[PDB]
Write a protein that binds this DNA or RNA. Sequence first.
RNA 1: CGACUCUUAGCGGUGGAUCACUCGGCUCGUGCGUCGAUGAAGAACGCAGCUAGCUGCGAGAAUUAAUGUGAAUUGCAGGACACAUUGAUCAUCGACACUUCGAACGCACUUGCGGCCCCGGGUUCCUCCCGGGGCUACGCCUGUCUGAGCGUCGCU
RNA 2: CACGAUCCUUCUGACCUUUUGGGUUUUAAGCAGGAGGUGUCAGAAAAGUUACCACAGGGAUAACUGGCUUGUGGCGGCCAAGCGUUCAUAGCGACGUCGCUUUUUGAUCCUUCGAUGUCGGCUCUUCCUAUCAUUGUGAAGCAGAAUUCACCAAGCGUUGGAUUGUUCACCCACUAAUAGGGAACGUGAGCUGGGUUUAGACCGUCGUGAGACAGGUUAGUUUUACCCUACUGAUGAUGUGUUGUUGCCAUGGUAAUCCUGCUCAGUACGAGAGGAACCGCAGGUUCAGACAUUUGGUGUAUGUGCUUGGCUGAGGAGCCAAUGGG
RNA 3: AAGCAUCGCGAAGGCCCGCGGCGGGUGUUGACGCGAUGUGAUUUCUGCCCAGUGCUCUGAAUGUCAAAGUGAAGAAAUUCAAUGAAGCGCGGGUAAACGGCGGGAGUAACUAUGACUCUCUUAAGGUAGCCAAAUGCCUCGUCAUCUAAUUAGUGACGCGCAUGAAUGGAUGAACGAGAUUCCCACUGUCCCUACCUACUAUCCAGCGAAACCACAGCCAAGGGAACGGGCUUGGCGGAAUCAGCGGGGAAAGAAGACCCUGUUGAGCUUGACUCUAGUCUGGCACGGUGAAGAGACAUGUUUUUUCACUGACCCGGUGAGGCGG
RNA 4: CCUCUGGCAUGUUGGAACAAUGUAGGUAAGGGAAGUCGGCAAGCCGGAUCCGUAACUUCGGGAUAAGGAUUGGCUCUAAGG
RNA 5: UGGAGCCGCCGCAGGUGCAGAUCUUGGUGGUAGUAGCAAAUAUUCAAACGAGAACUUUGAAGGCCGAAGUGGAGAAGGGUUCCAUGUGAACAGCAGUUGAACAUGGGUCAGUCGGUCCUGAGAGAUGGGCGAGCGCCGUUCCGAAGGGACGGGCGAUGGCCUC
RNA 6: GGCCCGUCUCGCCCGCCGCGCCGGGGAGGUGGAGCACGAGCGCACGUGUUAGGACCCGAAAGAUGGUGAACUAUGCCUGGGCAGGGCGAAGCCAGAGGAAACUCUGGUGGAGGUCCGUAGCGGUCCUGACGUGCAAAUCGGUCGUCCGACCUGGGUAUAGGGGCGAAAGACUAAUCGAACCAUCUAGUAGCUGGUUCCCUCCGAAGUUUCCCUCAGGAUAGCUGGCGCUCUCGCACACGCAGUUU
RNA 7: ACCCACCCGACCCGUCUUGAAACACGGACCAAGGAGUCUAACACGUGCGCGAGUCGGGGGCUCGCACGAAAGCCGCCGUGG
RNA 8: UAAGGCUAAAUACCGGCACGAGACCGAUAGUCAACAAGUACCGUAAGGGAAAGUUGAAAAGAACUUUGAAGAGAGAGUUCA
RNA 9: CGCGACCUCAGAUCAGACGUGGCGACCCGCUGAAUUUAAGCAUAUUAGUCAGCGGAGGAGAAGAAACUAACCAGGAUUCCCUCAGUAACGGCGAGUGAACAGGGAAGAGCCCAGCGCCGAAUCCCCGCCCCGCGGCGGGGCGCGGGACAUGUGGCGUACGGAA
Lengths: 244, 15
Amino acid sequence: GRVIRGQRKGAGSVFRAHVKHRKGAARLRAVDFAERHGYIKGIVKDIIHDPGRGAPLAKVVFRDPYRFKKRTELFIAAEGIHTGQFVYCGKKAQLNIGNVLPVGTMPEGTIVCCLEEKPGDRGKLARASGNYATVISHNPETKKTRVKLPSGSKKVISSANRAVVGVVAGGGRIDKPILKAGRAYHKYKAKRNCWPRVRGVAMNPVEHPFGGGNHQHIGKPSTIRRDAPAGRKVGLIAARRTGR
Amino acid sequence: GMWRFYTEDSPGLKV
RNA sequence: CGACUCUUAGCGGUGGAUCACUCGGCUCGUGCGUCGAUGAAGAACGCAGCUAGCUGCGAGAAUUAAUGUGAAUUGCAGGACACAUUGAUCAUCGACACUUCGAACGCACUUGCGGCCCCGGGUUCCUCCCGGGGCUACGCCUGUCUGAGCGUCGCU
RNA sequence: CACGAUCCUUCUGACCUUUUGGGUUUUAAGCAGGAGGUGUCAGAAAAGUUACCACAGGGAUAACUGGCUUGUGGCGGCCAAGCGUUCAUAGCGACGUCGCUUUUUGAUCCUUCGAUGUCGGCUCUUCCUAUCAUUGUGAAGCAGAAUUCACCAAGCGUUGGAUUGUUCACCCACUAAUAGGGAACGUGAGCUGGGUUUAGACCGUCGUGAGACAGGUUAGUUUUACCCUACUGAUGAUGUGUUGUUGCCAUGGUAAUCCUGCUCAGUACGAGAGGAACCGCAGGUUCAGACAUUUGGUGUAUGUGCUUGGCUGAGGAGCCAAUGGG
RNA sequence: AAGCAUCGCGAAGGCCCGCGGCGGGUGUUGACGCGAUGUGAUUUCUGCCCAGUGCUCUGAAUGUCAAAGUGAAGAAAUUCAAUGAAGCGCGGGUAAACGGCGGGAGUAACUAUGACUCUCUUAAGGUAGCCAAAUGCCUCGUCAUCUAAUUAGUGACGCGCAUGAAUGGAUGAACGAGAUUCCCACUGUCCCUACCUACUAUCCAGCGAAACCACAGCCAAGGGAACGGGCUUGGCGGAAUCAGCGGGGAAAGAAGACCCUGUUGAGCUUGACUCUAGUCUGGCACGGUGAAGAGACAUGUUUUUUCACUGACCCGGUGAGGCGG
RNA sequence: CCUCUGGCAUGUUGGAACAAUGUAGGUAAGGGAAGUCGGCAAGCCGGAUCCGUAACUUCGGGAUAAGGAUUGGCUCUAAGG
RNA sequence: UGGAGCCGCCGCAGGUGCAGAUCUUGGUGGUAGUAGCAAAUAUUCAAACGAGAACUUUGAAGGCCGAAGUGGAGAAGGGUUCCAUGUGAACAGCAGUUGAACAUGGGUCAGUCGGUCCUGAGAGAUGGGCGAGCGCCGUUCCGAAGGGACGGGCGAUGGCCUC
RNA sequence: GGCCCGUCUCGCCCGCCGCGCCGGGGAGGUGGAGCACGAGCGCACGUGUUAGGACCCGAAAGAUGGUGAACUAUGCCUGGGCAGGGCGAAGCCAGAGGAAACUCUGGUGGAGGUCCGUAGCGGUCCUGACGUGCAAAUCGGUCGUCCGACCUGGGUAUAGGGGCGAAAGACUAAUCGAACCAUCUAGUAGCUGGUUCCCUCCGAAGUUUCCCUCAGGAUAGCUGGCGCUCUCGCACACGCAGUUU
RNA sequence: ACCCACCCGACCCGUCUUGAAACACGGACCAAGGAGUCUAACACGUGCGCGAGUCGGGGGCUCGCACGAAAGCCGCCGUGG
RNA sequence: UAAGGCUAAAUACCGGCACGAGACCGAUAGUCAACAAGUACCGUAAGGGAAAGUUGAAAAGAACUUUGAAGAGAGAGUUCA
RNA sequence: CGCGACCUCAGAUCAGACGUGGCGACCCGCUGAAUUUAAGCAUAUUAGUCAGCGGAGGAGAAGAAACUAACCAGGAUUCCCUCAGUAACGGCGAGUGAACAGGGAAGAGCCCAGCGCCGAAUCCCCGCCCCGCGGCGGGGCGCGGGACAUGUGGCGUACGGAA
Ligand SMILES: [Mg+2]
Ligand SMILES: [Mg+2]
Ligand SMILES: [Mg+2]
Ligand SMILES: [Mg+2]
Ligand SMILES: [Mg+2]
Ligand SMILES: [Mg+2]
Ligand SMILES: [Mg+2]
Ligand SMILES: [Mg+2]
Ligand SMILES: [Mg+2]
Ligand SMILES: [Mg+2]
Ligand SMILES: [Mg+2]
Ligand SMILES: [Mg+2]
Ligand SMILES: [Mg+2]
Ligand SMILES: [Mg+2]
Ligand SMILES: [Mg+2]
Ligand SMILES: [Mg+2]
Ligand SMILES: [Mg+2]
Ligand SMILES: [Mg+2]
Ligand SMILES: [Mg+2]
Ligand SMILES: [Mg+2]
Ligand SMILES: [Mg+2]
Ligand SMILES: [Mg+2]
Ligand SMILES: [Mg+2]
Ligand SMILES: [Mg+2]
Ligand SMILES: [Mg+2]
Ligand SMILES: [Mg+2]
Ligand SMILES: [Mg+2]
Ligand SMILES: [Mg+2]
Ligand SMILES: [Mg+2]
Ligand SMILES: [Mg+2]
Ligand SMILES: [Mg+2]
Ligand SMILES: [Mg+2]
Ligand SMILES: [Mg+2]
Ligand SMILES: [Mg+2]
Ligand SMILES: [Mg+2]
Ligand SMILES: [Mg+2]
Ligand SMILES: [Mg+2]
Ligand SMILES: [Mg+2]
Ligand SMILES: [Mg+2]
Ligand SMILES: [Mg+2]
Ligand SMILES: [Mg+2]
Ligand SMILES: [Mg+2]
Ligand SMILES: [Mg+2]
Ligand SMILES: [Mg+2]
Ligand SMILES: [Mg+2]
Ligand SMILES: [Mg+2]
Ligand SMILES: [Mg+2]
Ligand SMILES: [Mg+2]
Ligand SMILES: [Mg+2]
Ligand SMILES: [Mg+2]
Ligand SMILES: [Mg+2]
Ligand SMILES: [Mg+2]
Ligand SMILES: [Mg+2]
Ligand SMILES: [Mg+2]
Ligand SMILES: [Mg+2]
Ligand SMILES: [Mg+2]
Ligand SMILES: [Mg+2]
Ligand SMILES: [Mg+2]
Ligand SMILES: [Mg+2]
Ligand SMILES: [Mg+2]
Ligand SMILES: [Mg+2]
Ligand SMILES: [Mg+2]
Ligand SMILES: [Mg+2]
Ligand SMILES: [Mg+2]
Ligand SMILES: [Mg+2]
Ligand SMILES: [Mg+2]
Ligand SMILES: [Mg+2]
Ligand SMILES: [Mg+2]
Ligand SMILES: [Mg+2]
Ligand SMILES: [Mg+2]
Ligand SMILES: [Mg+2]
Ligand SMILES: [Mg+2]
Ligand SMILES: [Mg+2]
Ligand SMILES: [Mg+2]
Ligand SMILES: [Mg+2]
Ligand SMILES: [Mg+2]
Ligand SMILES: [Mg+2]
Ligand SMILES: [Mg+2]
Ligand SMILES: [Mg+2]
Ligand SMILES: [Mg+2]
Ligand SMILES: [Mg+2]
Ligand SMILES: [Mg+2]
Ligand SMILES: [Mg+2]
Ligand SMILES: [Mg+2]
Ligand SMILES: [Mg+2]
Ligand SMILES: [Mg+2]
Ligand SMILES: [Mg+2]
Ligand SMILES: [Mg+2]
Ligand SMILES: [Mg+2]
Ligand SMILES: [Mg+2]
């Protein structure tokens, strides 16, 4: 019968992200002669809170090296950053915390965050709240490097691509219980319309494959193909193993 | 015309 | 017989059938076969001595001019006119005119903001200020001017 | 009796026809006979569910009532083998048999599907008798007491509660007795809505599932009378010349009920245990018809005090607070 | 709903929109995230079953498997051959995936039950718990308790028609316009009704509707489409009205929601029949350069394998700001 | 709940009665849920001060638990800047 | 009665005959002078006007709303309902001397109160892309997307070409 | 009996520019909507049967293209709103005890999807009023909540097999298990209902076989109408029967 | 034919139905409207014309059509059916 | 003789302008519309969508008297009525 | 590091033109159902039909054979009669369904590219004069611009054409 919640999310409208009070996209600096060859220094003017983001950001002010002009950036704050700190960045950047250098330079066992997945992308992996990647090992020829992400996957990467040293700030956020529904409500009110979530079993059988029945049961296996048309693809999508 | 009975009243109900 | 009720008739009411009319339709046929940036169709707002509606018209607004016609128009006024005079009234319509939206065109739809040329007050080009006029849509064609390119060459 | 049309397919058959401007050869199409099947067998290619439901209709068809029927249920005879210490028949009654009843349930499908409101309870009237009690009596295996059996008989009665939606059931208690039934399984414009029997939900079982369940659970709108009649009361009506009076009475209706105590009497009767009755007297129950002297209830005589908050400057006199409160 | 627990996804990605786009939402995001499910605070637990249906993992070792391409004979349409992707099959994993979780016999020096033993059988055979519960047919189960009396309530029992573990089991303070049961108090709920007040109803002035209506309107019985206002046979019948009343008009209402028929439908479902967006795979096309080599056939051809390259094509960044020599 | 400022004419009419049924309010002897499916409905309770407070509990609660006492008027006293 | 057209015969032609269709449109009954004009405590006395007063107005008294108002001002919506004078046909479910009715006239004055300007969520042209197509997508993305400014120079005119 | 065309069976002869896998006949069966001295064509009227809106009125549906979020659902932007009490969380102070650890006592403090309770928001029970209403869902009392997943104005977003849904198949302008508006559309109906003047004559059937047939058709039967061919009461009859012999 | 009396007879129509006065449905009353049509195709019957033919269309020739969008005629008279 | 192009005529015509006619309809008919009709009115909007003709030849449309607050009457008069 | 050709591309309120919307009976191009019929239904049918979008004209479209035929042959298109409810299609069911010939209405035929020849022999726009001017045209005259050899004009196009 109906289009199920899930399918409607793609259309946007009501399920678009709430983004008025968000401070900006949380990127690294753009590459340039300075970053590519030496190091550009910039100070941390303030640390901020960004709605719908666990991590804190940092307003970091550089000087544009072509026009007399003080550019500014929004880094994801590595934990241990403070205001009135200097943040150095580039190839000849030193290996301390809050210091974006190319993964290639930094040694094995180096902890990083806001890691560029591709060179020049301005910081894509491991940038949540208490998260970090680890540089495993370099392959000098091929100019490539191996990195262990937060998920536990070990991804290969161009030595060129950069990442900030140290973990992300605002760690352990998920340790505190929420307790109140309201405290959940307020969390997702800063993000998007995704919260008080009705179980498919409760729904009639027009608004969910699991719906209907004189008992709240599923009635078909809750695992499912991922060669599955959007509508059925519900429950445990291509679940390799399902249990505890 | 006059209202008479509600829709779910169905006056002479003999199920 | 008394009142009431019923029936029938007379007259009267209620109601608007029937009949009789018909500046309306419906159908068939004939001829022509024409809209619009030179601003259409449509919409809006206006316009009469007294006029609300319909119709008619556009700030020249129940119409101007012209031509034909030849004494009205008429609900009441008032008037005109010498109806032996371009001359009332109608008709025709070739000249003139035609508010604002609208393809809708300076940009916006508040009826709001503008730019650029010329003119009058205002100055004595002092720019202001006010008023008036004329331009200021997109697309595309032919040409025109100014240009761009480590596009292809030449001469220096 | 042991079997199958069109269309399609397949095979077989002839020096066969056509395969299109002509000719050769493949191919295809024809013609004629078999075979491949339609068992819903004169021959569609086809799974559920709906309580979220809809439409056209149907009393050609169910779920009430009411009809017929009466198997089944209930009630009642005949016969008499037995029981009854003895004795078929006081009271019973086998094996058989004949009936009635429509307060059981079935059969049935006549009536109603442009709808006859679907269980119970409450309330109220009336009718029946197949009589529990009470009146009058016949019987006994009736000494008395208690008693069953039968007759006239439906006048009068036939209750209060615990559980349950219940009908039904059971138990407590009282009683004279706690008999049984009918009236559209009396009675929803009388109520109620606890239950069945929409929609929400829960559980179990069943179903892959949607969903199902005379399986359990909880939540869930009960409309209209002012018409006619009926009944209740209320004015009136024709007659008698008019009016009043005091009256008669046709017809309708109708009412009383049952119990206890005392006495008879510890008497009859009885071995005793136990244990009556008639006439009297004193009272009570249920019902009926009145009434307010008394007791009680009401009370806005807004009667008279008392009191809260406020308001007429205060006193006094009052008012307001949907009847200020008492 | 927090809490718990699963699942997918490292971005040319997961999930999803869109008729289409170098389209879009999540995403101003990056696993302490986004997406998809279940269960439902805490406490305490969460047994066994991978046989079935799902999901998933691997894959020349391999059954089948299409179009193209390759060979074959044929005059050609062609037929035949080999070749062979996903998917099925084959083989593992998975139950906080859908779900599922037994039946006989005999046995203890009174009897009874049966610790014990014997079989037959499954993928195991219901573990911990819990119970005649909102789940128990029989059923008003039995025993206790609560009452003078209890198909009710509570506590036990368990044989459980048909309880049971995130289809969550067992618990549980606080809370609940939630479902029951009893007690205290309180009461017109009742015995059993009464009186009082206001607004109505009532009568008048003024004003003034509607539904409904074949004709109408007293009964008994009869017969009748098997319950009559009318018909038959009886009883009977007296103008015009008022306030009431709910017996009857099988009163009004709405072309029965029930039930059945119709070759009438819709909503939903799936192992119905027929399709389809999407998705997965294979072919041809845009599609190039060089290197190496390798088989297969033949005595050059085809198949190409792997490794580079960059010029198409794609992606990212930037105010295209220092690129390679 | 009563009042001033300000605002109204009792909500589309009046009059006369004071029957039954109603709608909305009250009160009831003795009993006290015997009523009913069921305490439905109404009634009890209620404010403050002072005492006093159980089971159970996630130790927070439960809790206004429950159960008691007092409360006016007047005339003083003491204590707080 | 009515006041202008109409008929017989022979042929032809039809939108040719009504009691029903819960028929269609219009009209009228009985019901019926009936149901009814019962939510939110409340009225009374005098005078005035007037044909006429339960209801208008004035005065007096008694009442209510009781500053979370039945008071005083706005928003949206209405659109002349505002104010005055006059009318008593209709309407205002009795009445009316009254009214938001009807008929005549009147009435809204801003540099400062608001629109107007800004951006918000969003909407939406161009470039580009898609699209059989009306178009759609898209809003910074596959753009040669700035027409402005200062200072200098050179030219031209307009001016006591001085400045 | 005969003839023609198909078809079979059997048989014996003819023909010539081309003698042949040529052509032509015969006899006897058997298929044909055939011939056997023609009856059609045109026009008109009637009845019947169809195809069409098709006697009239009637669905539930289906499709195409548009209008709506002024109600309500949810997101976003910007504004506004929420007496008086109770309980008394962390933090802090003092004092007392403790040898230390720290503990007690009295305060202060004002936490909370905390309690009562107004406005606001809601809508439990009376199964109260009303039920041709004040009202196409209102009124009274009684209730739930009242600093938060709180209430609310304006703006803006999402549109019909679509939206939105703390999930009731709820809501989407009194409409929702698929909105409204117009068209396709006079949709189809084996089923309800209706179907208009007079007289005259005749006058049925509910059975047959077949049918996705059993509320319907087909086919026989039963009816009517039109006729024709003959017959003879015109002293001059053959045939037939719901009999009997 | 208007009214009234009396005796006898006599239930309300329409409709589906085996069966309706029905406790079956539709119907308060009156007016006007209101449902077997037209086209095509077939069939049989009947009337008329011609008859191994028949035919008329379609076209053409004759008029501005008053009556005419008729009527008449055509080696088209028969391409053709 | 394809992969390029132009071309009058007979043919179509429920819109338009301007005419003509009818075995049509005759105000519940005929167009929704004989009339101030796509009007009034309704709906947020798409959209829906009415009713409604007739004095008489001529206004000669009732001067005047009188009752009444008036509406309404009674006489008088106009008209063939 | 200039200046100059061209090529490809920009910008102009540059000079002068055109297109945009409406109407929609008829016409051309797409798009395209489902009621419905089949007594069910899915192919079929309804139907290349309604709705949707686009573009016209007084008509449009079509049109001068890559045609019919198989004859002793006809000879663009369109229209009417006929072919014909035929050949054919089709759960070969329901249903659908043309064409050629024949007779009429009308009647009309042509032009390029190419291949070639001819001093680009051609075109557009400027500017001055004479006429003409309410459908911007003729004639003349300008070392006045441009278009054009990446091809303009005359001859010529299958019926043959050129010399
Ligand atoms: Mg649900
Ligand atoms: Mg589904
Ligand atoms: Mg299951
Ligand atoms: Mg050939
Ligand atoms: Mg259900
Ligand atoms: Mg059921
Ligand atoms: Mg129905
Ligand atoms: Mg029956
Ligand atoms: Mg029965
Ligand atoms: Mg014996
Ligand atoms: Mg009844
Ligand atoms: Mg007896
Ligand atoms: Mg009963
Ligand atoms: Mg009754
Ligand atoms: Mg009732
Ligand atoms: Mg109930
Ligand atoms: Mg239910
Ligand atoms: Mg009354
Ligand atoms: Mg005093
Ligand atoms: Mg799970
Ligand atoms: Mg488990
Ligand atoms: Mg498995
Ligand atoms: Mg166990
Ligand atoms: Mg009890
Ligand atoms: Mg128990
Ligand atoms: Mg289980
Ligand atoms: Mg379970
Ligand atoms: Mg009757
Ligand atoms: Mg009654
Ligand atoms: Mg009824
Ligand atoms: Mg019906
Ligand atoms: Mg059938
Ligand atoms: Mg269906
Ligand atoms: Mg549907
Ligand atoms: Mg299948
Ligand atoms: Mg009052
Ligand atoms: Mg009053
Ligand atoms: Mg009022
Ligand atoms: Mg009492
Ligand atoms: Mg009782
Ligand atoms: Mg009781
Ligand atoms: Mg209560
Ligand atoms: Mg407690
Ligand atoms: Mg006349
Ligand atoms: Mg006619
Ligand atoms: Mg009639
Ligand atoms: Mg009255
Ligand atoms: Mg008050
Ligand atoms: Mg005011
Ligand atoms: Mg106010
Ligand atoms: Mg006023
Ligand atoms: Mg009035
Ligand atoms: Mg026939
Ligand atoms: Mg017909
Ligand atoms: Mg219809
Ligand atoms: Mg369909
Ligand atoms: Mg109620
Ligand atoms: Mg009532
Ligand atoms: Mg009222
Ligand atoms: Mg449901
Ligand atoms: Mg019809
Ligand atoms: Mg049938
Ligand atoms: Mg029938
Ligand atoms: Mg009848
Ligand atoms: Mg009957
Ligand atoms: Mg019927
Ligand atoms: Mg009726
Ligand atoms: Mg008629
Ligand atoms: Mg004939
Ligand atoms: Mg052409
Ligand atoms: Mg009319
Ligand atoms: Mg009329
Ligand atoms: Mg009309
Ligand atoms: Mg008339
Ligand atoms: Mg009329
Ligand atoms: Mg008239
Ligand atoms: Mg008339
Ligand atoms: Mg006359
Ligand atoms: Mg155009
Ligand atoms: Mg069909
Ligand atoms: Mg059918
Ligand atoms: Mg069908
Ligand atoms: Mg077709
Ligand atoms: Mg169309
Ligand atoms: Mg043309
Ligand atoms: Mg050509
Ligand atoms: Mg031809
Ligand atoms: Mg023919
Ligand atoms: Mg076709
Ligand atoms: Mg040339």
